[PDB]
Design a protein around this ligand. Structure first.
Ligand SMILES: [Br-]
Ligand SMILES: [Br-]
Ligand SMILES: [Br-]
Ligand SMILES: [Br-]
Ligand SMILES: [Co+2]
Ligand SMILES: [Co+2]
Length: 333
């Protein structure tokens, strides 16, 4: 246990099929979405119903393809208000053997279903209600199913971590101190990474259990270095999603990544795609102009294209193993 180890609290990762030892996690994708729906998708149920058999077939096919790559674990980062379905994730996991951790949390103000908790906040202690929800889902289970969330998902807006969002950050810090559960986050358009790390650590959350995400959204490495100073991990977790409404290209992501790797930050860098295996609501109508922005946007892209490109650029087998196996084992295990 060299380096920065988690402050003895959580002893094993909690997956949708039960507890799993850190050493059993293996190569892991720290931020993906088996299924996902933007708030409102359920309102379009008549014309956009969930085809369970089709979704299970497509998702198990993806899980099998990941296992072929030696990826044994996926962290599903889907917020409670964005189509999270623990029971479905368990079906996919039981069917294939792929380990899946699910999340507890609400999305950022710009895209989440915010009305409910904004209302609860106007009436009383919304932070405490959110804390109770997170704590119960992490320690006891979700929706009475016994399936527990293995990570807390937090998300902030671009210009600030809004009052609405801070309710979740404060509740999550409290649950993190009590259980030691991992925290993963969404940052909007390459902003607030430092602010998130400062806020969570100042609230007492363990930096060794924190992964600030969507950091590939910023192409100035000083921003990543400022975030990393807090002792937290950062994830380039939308690899393959290029030029989509402002995101950098993978070439730009790799430049920052290789610069950080050359500066010895391998112990704090994680890689994922933020892929969606099966969309909820009506199947997305992909515009002909956006086809290139999503061509590498699937979960086999890091295994097949990114890792070999890092290796040929001088990144070592040990560094790749640290990012894809070592880091996840410590952060989620
Ligand atoms: Br469920
Ligand atoms: Br279902
Ligand atoms: Br609020
Ligand atoms: Br490799
Ligand atoms: Co996100
Ligand atoms: Co995501």
């Amino acid at each position: 246990s060299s380096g920065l180890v988690p402050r003895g609290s959580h002893m094993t990762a909690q997956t949708v099929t039960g507890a799993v030892a850190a050493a059993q996690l293996g190569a892991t994708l720290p931020h993906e979405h088996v299924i996902f729906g933007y708030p409102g998708y359920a309102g379009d149920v008549t014309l956009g119903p969930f085809d369970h058999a089709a979704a299970l077939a497509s998702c198990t096919e993806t899980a099998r393809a990941l296992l072929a790559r030696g990826i044994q674990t996926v962290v599903d980062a889907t917020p409670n208000d964005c189509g999270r379905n623990p029971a479905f994730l368990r079906e996919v996991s039981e069917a294939t053997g792929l380990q899946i951790l699910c999340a507890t949390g609400f999305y950022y103000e710009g895209e989440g279903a915010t009305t409910y908790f904004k209302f609860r906040a106007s009436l009383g202690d919304a932070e405490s209600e959110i804390y109770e929800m997170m704590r119960t889902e992490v320690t006891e289970g979700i929706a009475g199913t016994g399936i527990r969330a293995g990570v807390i998902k937090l998300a902030s807006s671009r210009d600030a971590i809004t009052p609405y969002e801070q309710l979740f950050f404060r509740a999550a810090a409290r649950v993190q101190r009590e259980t030691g559960v991992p925290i993963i986050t969404h940052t909007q358009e390459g902003q607030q990474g430092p602010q998130q790390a400062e806020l969570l650590t100042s609230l007492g959350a363990d930096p060794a259990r924190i992964m600030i995400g969507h950091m590939d959204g910023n192409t100035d490495p000083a921003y990543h270095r400022e975030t990393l100073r807090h002792g937290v991990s950062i994830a380039f977790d939308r690899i393959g999603l290029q030029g989509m409404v402002g995101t950098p290209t993978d070439a730009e992501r790799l430049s920052v990544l290789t610069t950080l790797l050359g500066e010895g930050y391998a112990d704090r860098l994680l890689l994922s795609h933020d892929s969606i295996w099966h969309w909820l609501g009506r199947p997305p109508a992909i515009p002909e102009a956006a086809l290139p922005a999503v061509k590498d946007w699937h979960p086999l892209h890091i295994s097949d294209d990114i890792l070999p490109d890092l290796r040929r650029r001088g990144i070592t087998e040990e560094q790749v193993g640290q990012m894809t196996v070592g880091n996840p084992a410590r952060l989620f295990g």
